[PDB]
Symmetry: D2
Subunit: 222 residues, 4 copies
């Protein structure tokens, strides 16, 4: 109906720079828009091996892949097949900061979703979990999604924790704007989305895999 | 079992200072620990009429009043009847900041819960929603609750929105530590709590009423 | 002329609560308004010994004691003898937060300046420099002072570093509003003030001493 | 001695993306390393006309151009002719965020300094001063420069104000790391630098000019 089928494929290109190191990452994978699941495999083709933990890039590679109850308006699916863009800031508690822009576009012909990313960051401390690769996975999280009705865009807000090998928690504040590639017809009331995101790594060429399950749920409290 | 019954009464004393103005507020109300509901009525007995919106004080007056599924450890109820203390910072987006400390203690004899608060704030702009009283209610929110196992305490984190009469959203970041008044035996895995909080105001003496429904829910994603 | 003489005496009362611990501190000392120097001695009379480093309270006990070139309007001296109030937030990098309100009033009769403070804080980590007393002194700093002409008040902004015994730096963001106790006649262009602040401690009763030198200087760059 | 002469020329290339709009800017100008002055002219060659105020990019195009008293170690000049890189985050008070990386390299042959920049940003509000071009100039500022001795790098910290056409002030927090392109021999004690930065705009092709005067000064307070 909007270009999507219960099972689809995805391609991801990310160009970036962290702490002055450039890199390019390319990724393919499988996803289930209505189940709210993606699984994707990534490969560094430039700048490898990354001197910073791969975890920082994970949310840098798609809300189309969210399970939405039919009662709530799905802005992301509604934007398809042309798709949507978004931008996000990442504010880490040790002062590091990153920013990401992503253009997402559905190719109905090939039943494939494309993701081009620019990812940039700075001020990760040399002696901190990211440049020393002491991060494990991101905790599950619950995101708030708020309409900016006058603008036709959405804002997301979620405070995120990265778990440390050595026990602890490393915080990162995510602030996101989501913009349909053309004017939507309806606009959701605000709502939550719950997320789970896991990484499993893979010595010739740096590679790894990510999985995400996400589910939307109304403001309403029983 | 821990001093609590399905229906209870509450008393609230808050002493504070906002933008240099002091005040004292006293409150009584009714609550349902296991349903996760309180309703409470408040009266200014000093410093009235408040020159700042009453909304800022709302979370300043109890997690005992949260509905907890039996599967997740309820730290707050477990701390009763002696109870617990907590402290919270409030970081508003226009630069204003507030802090609150609260001592909570259950009187099993009288089936009553006492709440003593100190509330302080500064740097609310004269020409902003709080000092001009243009705030409506707080949006529903979803709080994260994280164990600090080594310390026996909990940390809460939730980014909060106050709605404006004139449409918009005014943000406030809440960071909280919760400390049982003596050493707990078990410690919850981390979890979410969903909140709803509403104000209805009441010309002799400044008074108003607050209602809260809150429900805990596990990290797990179906 | 405004109640002040090249040498004066000061009295300081601070009531506070940090991390749930209350206390009262009383202080006397000597100061030189036009040289921009104070030296003051402090004594805990309640809640002693403090479980948190004394450094956090240092800026919590007077801009009257700033050296001002005659070319720039001195708002603080101009507010005397009635004096002025102020409020400040303190945002530490580990998430702790404090707030202070202070009423300052000159007693020309006795050539004495009074300082009443309320100081409150929360969320200092148990295992961090403040609750473990691993702080040394605050680095020198340069504060920005900005007029809010329409309101007749001033805003101060300075990012502050506390030095750690074990080498490092612990950051704290200070945001301040300064309010004359009645309407001033002129209002400064904005400007810098440079600060130096040092602590030397003193087993019967917890006591210590603070010294401050501060000098104002115009926006202008040679 | 380190490749520099009292008068030099500069070339600037910046590639960027703000709020999803890409662009390329190219710039030439004249500078006086030891007087701490640059003046530079800029031209958009891609993406013009910018939909966001030009002010945001101003600090995005060199500390070599700082007047340093001989008593304080000049890390930047010392890094020449090979030069140095740096990265900076920009945290605006309305939630927008930007990041910049810059590689600076001196061509002694041609008495020219090259500046390649990547500049990225997001979450500038549509209805805010930057996307509506209501900004004037940046106020003068005083930056703190702190050595990270173990790493051989420097950290800068300065809270910045952009002035608004319609009167007001728009805040931006700058955090910077400066990294010599090879290991320096000495390391400065920390210090201040005072900055002044002004823009004058110029209908065929979007162009404009920037000027900067900057002067370093020791921690010491007379």
């Amino acid at each position: 109906k909007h270009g999507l089928k219960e099972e689809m494929t995805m391609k991801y290109h990310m160009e970036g720079c962290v702490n002055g190191h450039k890199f390019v990452i390319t990724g393919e994978g499988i996803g289930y828009p209505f189940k709210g699941k993606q699984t994707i495999n990534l490969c560094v083709i430039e700048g490898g091996p990354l001197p910073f933990s791969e975890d920082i890039l994970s949310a840098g590679f798609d809300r189309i892949f969210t399970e939405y109850p039919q009662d709530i308006v799905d802005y992301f699916k509604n934007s398809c097949p042309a798709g949507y863009t978004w931008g996000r800031s990442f504010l880490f508690e040790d002062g590091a900061v990153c920013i990401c822009n992503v253009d997402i576009t559905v190719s109905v012909k090939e039943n494939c979703i494309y993701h081009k990313s620019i990812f940039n960051g700075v001020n990760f401390p040399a002696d901190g979990p990211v440049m020393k690769k002491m991060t494990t996975n991101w905790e599950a999280s619950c995101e708030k999604i708020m309409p900016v009705p006058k603008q036709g865009i959405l804002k997301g807000d979620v405070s995120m924790y990265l778990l440390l090998k050595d026990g602890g928690r490393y915080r990162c504040q995510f602030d996101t704007v989501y913009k349909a590639k053309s004017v939507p017809s309806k606009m959701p009331e605000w709502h939550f989305i719950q997320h789970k995101l896991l990484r499993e790594d893979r010595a010739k060429n740096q590679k790894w895999q990510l999985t995400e399950h996400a589910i939307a749920f109304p403001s309403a409290l029983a």
